[PDB]
Amino acid sequence: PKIHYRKDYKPSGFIINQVTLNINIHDQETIVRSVLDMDISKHNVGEDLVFDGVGLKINEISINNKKLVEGEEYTYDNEFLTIFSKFVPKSKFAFSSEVIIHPETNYALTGLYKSKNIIVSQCEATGFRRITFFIDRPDMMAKYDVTVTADKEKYPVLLSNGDKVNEFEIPGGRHGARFNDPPLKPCYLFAVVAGDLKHLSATYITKYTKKKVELYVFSEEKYVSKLQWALECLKKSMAFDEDYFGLEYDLSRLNLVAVSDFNVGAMENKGLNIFNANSLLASKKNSIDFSYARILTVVGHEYFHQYTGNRVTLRDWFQLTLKEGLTVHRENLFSEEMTKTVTTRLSHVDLLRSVQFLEDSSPLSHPIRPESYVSMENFYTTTVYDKGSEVMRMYLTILGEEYYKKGFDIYIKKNDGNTATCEDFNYAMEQAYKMKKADNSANLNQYLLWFSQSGTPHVSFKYNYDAEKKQYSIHVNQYTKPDENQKEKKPLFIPISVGLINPENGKEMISQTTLELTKESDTFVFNNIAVKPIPSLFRGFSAPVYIEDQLTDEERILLLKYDSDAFVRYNSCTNIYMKQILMNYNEFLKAKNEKLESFQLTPVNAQFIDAIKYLLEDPHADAGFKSYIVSLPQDRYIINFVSNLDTDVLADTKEYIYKQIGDKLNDVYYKMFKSLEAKADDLTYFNDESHVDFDQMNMRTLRNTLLSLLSKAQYPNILNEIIEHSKSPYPSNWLTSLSVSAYFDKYFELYDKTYKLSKDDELLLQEWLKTVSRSDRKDIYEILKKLENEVLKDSKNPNDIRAVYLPFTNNLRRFHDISGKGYKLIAEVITKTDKFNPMVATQLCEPFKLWNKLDTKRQELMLNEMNTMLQEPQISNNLKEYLLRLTNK
Ligand SMILES: O=C(CC1CCCC1)N[C@@H](C(=O)NO)c1ccc(-c2cc(F)c(F)c(F)c2)cc1
Ligand SMILES: [Mg+2]
Ligand SMILES: [Mg+2]
Ligand SMILES: [Mg+2]
Ligand SMILES: [Zn+2]
């Protein structure tokens, strides 16, 4: 297994200047002819010419139109085509090849493949080599001239990058289209699509150049009525890049294409963005509310890549976070501006501190720019994406908007049209830093440790107030635990956005302030502080760290009620919950270990419950924020704070705390569930796909959260509400009715009702599958078997497999059944999936990421299943390398 090392980067001895492709799609095979106009680079030392080429069937290869012969002049081992250096020209030459590939049976969904009746490519990271021979790395930038031919009846729509410059008929019912893309691009941005596609289209006029851009959104005919929101989102994305960053689209046309079979969310191929249908298609009758923010996010993300990834690209794959972290950050700015809801930022923090913090304390922990890799298909991690985004966001926090925009424009102007590295971005940010500090000696050299140092920093606080001096001090300490990547961790540049709240009136005591912590510890002193404040720390979650606020629950309640910052209010609530959870967990654990016949549990803080009621009853307070405060922290957030976590004890702990709060607040919950109905379920715009109301969707989130709490509590006659909820036109509601009916004898009645509502829309049926999978049912294992036999069967669609199994893996009580039956089940699915889709098989390993954080019995059970998977003779490269790293082999 070849290990690639970041320090080993060297430019190629060759240059590829022009790619001319002929892709001829036939019924049982696809023939790919390619001419590469090539040259010898200044770094050449007379080496063999080695092309990447994976799974290609060679018909012929030639240099300068002279056919090469296997064995004497070249070897091919199904991975590398080697042309011996004595046959490689010493000046400009043409390399040509004709190969046969087979998209119909390409179930791994990389390279050229068939998704239902659509032929589609996926080339990032190293998938272009599955289509034709290439030096398949992003610094080999070239011009592309691409012709595609196909049966006209089956494939009337043909698309590739660039301008369509010819269309022509071919004998035998075939036709072709030629696409010329003159701007240089790396091969991972190549794409081709062929199918019987239907579309919506619009014309966008850019802000400054006033160029007309044609926008096309494509799907199969059955779902063309689900394209409208995506088109709206694309217009919004273009306007935001113009308005915030001053950046306009440079091409005449942008196509977005939905396909049913896709390994991830979407892909930014230049002018031809290709999407998982679940991240492009929606309608109000056939989609849950989550689809609307998802499509906005993913359309936005792929659009923002046109600058941060496409026009400025990567020198090498170790720079992945330079385009992904930065594009996630750009999408976050966009979505926060579009939704105007605090829950957009809170949702990203919620994901980071559960999923990404877990990764960063697991054996898989890596920095956002790793030092090595074996599988690029395993490289696309929440660390690279989401911690990367927080690292890109910290530059904006440090510089402020005006200087951040100045630094970003420096980055774009200096690197437009070229490859770049993480240092290039830090350099541009540093220039803005010098401007802001009015100090040409200022630098961001320490900031580079965010790219190289793995692990989550811990930031802790102590305070001092001198009432006579009116002097307040915040003493701050930072610590990152040593791990496999650094034995000694260095202090980072941590920006701490802070406010000081007057506890008597709730008002701000200082102006906007960002503490710059650059040492292992520092003391920040504030004068003329007239009363002892409550500090509001890491406003907006200003650095990706474990925050240890050292506040009392009384102080946290005051912030929860009266602070100005949504994150600090949410975090103060989180911290109150965590203190309770750890305390009750240990009490339950003691009772279990000591086999106690009786014991006591510490009750939930009554002033905390009073504060929740106060916020819930405030009509001016935000419904999305309300849904967060009545929900306990994510299990994957909690696990970062408990060694040898017994999942049964945690489930008992959560149950006690929810029952404590519900015993006091259930009448409030029910009153709110009823009073929110009119605005939450308003149908005024149900048949307008352009009208999306994120506040209204948050009201539905709150109602569906409250209904779940009330159903679990067996609130009197709540089943009446559940049944009426099942009749709502909104899938978010009627799928919720299925979920919350798990606690009643009507579950299988609603199972059948909602199945019939879902079965005729591919994506809605996947949402139904997720709802069943996550149902809190004692018979969930029997239910999963029913889904397997009746709905899923032997589908190779990743959306189907992920929908059936991943939600169930979050069932704390049942997935972690002490028999190990849940670990056995998912391991069987992983091994089965690995036969045809190694990338998705590795995604299905997600529940095992926390294996060494569980109690010792469950550690043993998970490890046994992982070792069983590792012993499969046919295990893929992806899955083997992932499980070897995860099990510390
Ligand atoms: O969809 C997402 C996550 C979403 C983005 C917005 C909301 C979260 N991310 C994709 C992305 O960054 N798009 O810009 C992304 C695209 C291709 C690959 C990828 C595919 C393969 F088939 C490979 F083999 C491979 F090595 C790599 C992995 C990820
Ligand atoms: Mg092949
Ligand atoms: Mg405008
Ligand atoms: Mg299907
Ligand atoms: Zn991306």
Domain end call among 143, 163, 197: 197
CB atoms within 10 A of CB 850: 21
Residues flanking ion ligand 2, Cβ below 5 Å: 55
Q: Give the closest ligand to the alpha carbon of residue 248.
A: 3
Same domain, yes or no: 42 and 180: yes
| Residues carrying an active site annotation | 302
- Say whether both 67 and 156 belong to one domain: yes
Residue nearest atom 13 in ligand 1 by C-alpha distance: 267
Closest CA to 563 of 615, 605, 518, 630: 615
Q: Which of 233, 220, 217 is nearest to 259 (CA)?
A: 220
Q: Is 558 inside any structural domain?
A: yes
Q: How many CB atoms lie within 10 A of CB 42?
A: 7
User: If you take atom 17 of ligand 1, which residue's CA is the nearest one?
Assistant: 267
Q: Which ligand approaches the C-alpha of residue 293 most closely? A: 1
In a domain, 58, yes or no: yes
Quick one: tokens of 559? 């912030």
> What's the domain range around 431?
284-454
- Greatest pairwise CA separation for the chain in angstroms: 94
Produce one character per residue of 721-731: b if its CB has 16 or more CB atoms within 10 Å, e if not. Answer: bbbebbebebb
Query: 79 and 149: one domain?
Result: yes
Tell me the CATH number at 345: 1.10.390.10
Exposure letters 757-789 (e unless 16+ CB within 10 A, then b): bbeebbbbbbbbbbbbbbbbbeebbebbeebee
CA 58 to chain CA centroid, Å, is: 38
Structure tokens at 479: 């610590």
Residue 5 within any structural domain of the chain: no
My answer on whether 545 and 575 are in the same domain is no
Distance, CA of 360 to CA of 385 (rounded, Å): 13
Q: How far is the CA of 177 from the centre of ligand 5 (A)?
A: 28
- Determine whether the annotation assigns residue 329 to a binding site: no
In a domain, 590, yes or no: yes
Experimental method: X-ray
Q: How far apart are CA 543 and CA 556, in angstroms?
A: 20
Provide the token pair at 586. 């240990």
The number of folded domains in the chain is 5
Cis peptide before 125 (omega within 30 of 0): yes
Q: Within a domain: residue 438?
A: yes
Q: How far is CA 392 from the centre of its chain?
A: 15
462 and 521 fall within a common domain: yes
Q: Show which of 454, 473, 488 is a domain's final residue.
A: 454
> What is the rounded CA–CA span in Å between residue 450 and residue 518?
12
Distance of CA 171 to the CA centre of its chain: 46
Last residue of a domain, one of 489, 519, 550: 550
* Site residues for ligand 1, CB cut-off 6 Å: 110, 122, 124-125, 127, 263-268, 297-298, 301-302, 305, 324, 376-377, 380, 839
3 in any annotated domain: no
70 in a structural domain: yes
Which residue, 574, 560, 659, is CA-closest to 615? 560
On whether the CB atoms of residues 134 and 61 are closer than 8 A, the answer is: no
Resolution value in angstroms: 1.5
Q: Is 748 domain-assigned?
A: yes
Let me know whether 277 and 349 are in one domain: no
Q: Which of ligand 1's atoms lies nearest the C-alpha of 301? A: 6
Q: Looking at residue 35, which CATH number applies to its domain? A: 2.60.40.1730
What CATH number is associated with residue 579? 1.25.50.10
* 236 alpha carbon, closest ligand: 3
Query: Does residue 761 come out as left (phi exceeding 0), alpha (psi in the -120 to 50 range) or beta?
Result: beta
Q: Are 378 and 882 in contact (CB under 8 A)?
A: yes
Closest CA to 293 of 339, 259, 353, 239: 339
Contact 5, 371 (CB under 8 A): yes
Q: Say yes or no: 780 and 709 in one domain.
A: yes
Nearest-CA residue for atom 7 of ligand 1: 298
User: Are residue 411 and residue 353 in the same domain, yes or no?
Assistant: yes
Question: Looking at ligand 1, which residue's alpha carbon is closest to its atom 4?
Answer: 265
Chain position carrying tokens 């200096």 = 414
671 lies in the same domain as 593: yes
The answer on 353 and 417 residing in a single domain is: yes
CATH of the domain at 485: 2.60.40.1840
Residue 129 forms beta bridges with which residues? none
Query: What is the helix (H) or strand (E) element at residue 780, kind and residue range?
Result: helix 780-787
Same domain, 46 and 184: yes
Residue 474 and residue 361 in one domain: no
Spell out the residues 6+ positions from residue 346 whose beta carbon is closer than 8 angstroms to its own. Answer: 566, 567, 570, 624, 625, 628
